[PDB]
């Protein structure tokens, strides 16, 4: 089914039509808290807000608002937190969320500067000896080490809660070559990165939900989570071919608006899942073939 559908849609040049139908059929729920006048400076884009029903709340009497949503894929048995790229005044709120939700990993799919414009604050330290202290939420964040590859970087960060005196290791999975409104260089380089996240244990149910972000926390981020989710379903279902990508994406859109921003991201998502299915079907060797193909040197 899935692979035949990709064919017919490509044959038809109907990607745009298919993607527009998704847009038209997506959920609409209220975002009243996001829209409160006091939260204007907590929102990067006017047109990207969390639904009230799925918003992550900060453990704060002051103002519990962050632009972040919990995507809870019931059949897949995986949750993700999708958030915007934090603003200069929200970096503290970001790491407070990571802390309160017990996340292990943060997946960043954007750069801080894209096409000449600041898309995301510099929310993590670039140098070991220049740790960050978030005064408002009483957190400290230290770069321990990093592993730079050709198209992504993995960082080991230590997050300390200054109130409770506890520390946690956070893994930062940063895809540094995925353009805004664009797609990865290939399914293999995408999968190699996704499988690296998976193998780190950051997506395990013993931790809180991964935080996945881009600039808005919907386009690239949507692409990443939809692939992962579909590949999970492929592995759980009696029939691996029953996975309907369009349905899985409308399901995710119940939780955060606007996931997958272009038709070509939608198409890439299908490519990824189709290729990724070789692993799921049992051929655990193809991981090594993605690694080599991705040119991570």
């Amino acid at each position: 089914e899935m692979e035949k559908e990709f064919e017919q849609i490509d044959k038809s040049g109907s990607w745009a039509a298919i993607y527009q139908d998704i847009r038209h059929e997506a959920s609409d729920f209220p975002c009243r808290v996001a829209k409160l006048p006091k939260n204007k400076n907590r929102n990067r884009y006017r047109d990207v807000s969390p639904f009230d029903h799925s918003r992550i709340k900060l453990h704060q009497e002051d103002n519990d608002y962050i632009n972040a949503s919990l995507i809870k894929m019931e059949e897949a048995q995986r949750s993700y937190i999708l958030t915007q790229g934090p603003l200069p005044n929200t970096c503290g709120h970001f790491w407070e969320m990571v802390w309160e939700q017990k996340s292990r990993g943060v997946v960043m799919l954007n750069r801080v500067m894209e096409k000449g414009s600041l898309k995301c604050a510099q929310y993590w330290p670039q140098k070991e000896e220049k740790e960050m202290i978030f005064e408002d939420t009483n957190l400290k964040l230290t770069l321990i080490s990093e592993d730079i590859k050709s198209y992504y970087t993995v960082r080991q960060l230590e997050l300390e809660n200054l109130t409770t005196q506890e520390t946690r290791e956070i893994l930062h999975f940063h895809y540094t070559t995925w353009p805004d409104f664009g797609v990865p260089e290939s399914p293999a380089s995408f999968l190699n990165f996704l499988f690296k996240v998976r193998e780190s244990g950051s997506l395990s149910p013993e931790h809180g939900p991964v935080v996945v972000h881009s600039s808005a926390g919907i386009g690239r981020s949507g692409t990443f989570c939809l692939a992962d989710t579909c590949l999970l379903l492929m592995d759980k279902r009696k029939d691996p071919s029953s996975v309907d990508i369009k349905k899985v994406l409308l399901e995710m859109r119940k939780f955060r608006m606007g996931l997958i921003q272009t038709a070509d991201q939608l198409r890439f998502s299908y490519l990824a899942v189709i290729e990724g299915a070789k692993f799921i079907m049992g051929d655990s060797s193809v991981q090594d073939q993605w690694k080599e193909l991705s040119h991570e040197d």
Binding site: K40, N43, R44, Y45, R46, D47, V48, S215, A216, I218, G219, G258, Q261
Partner: peptide
């Protein structure tokens, strides 16, 4: 404000 889609 800025708009992500556009």
């Amino acid at each position: 404000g800025p708009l992500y889609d556009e």
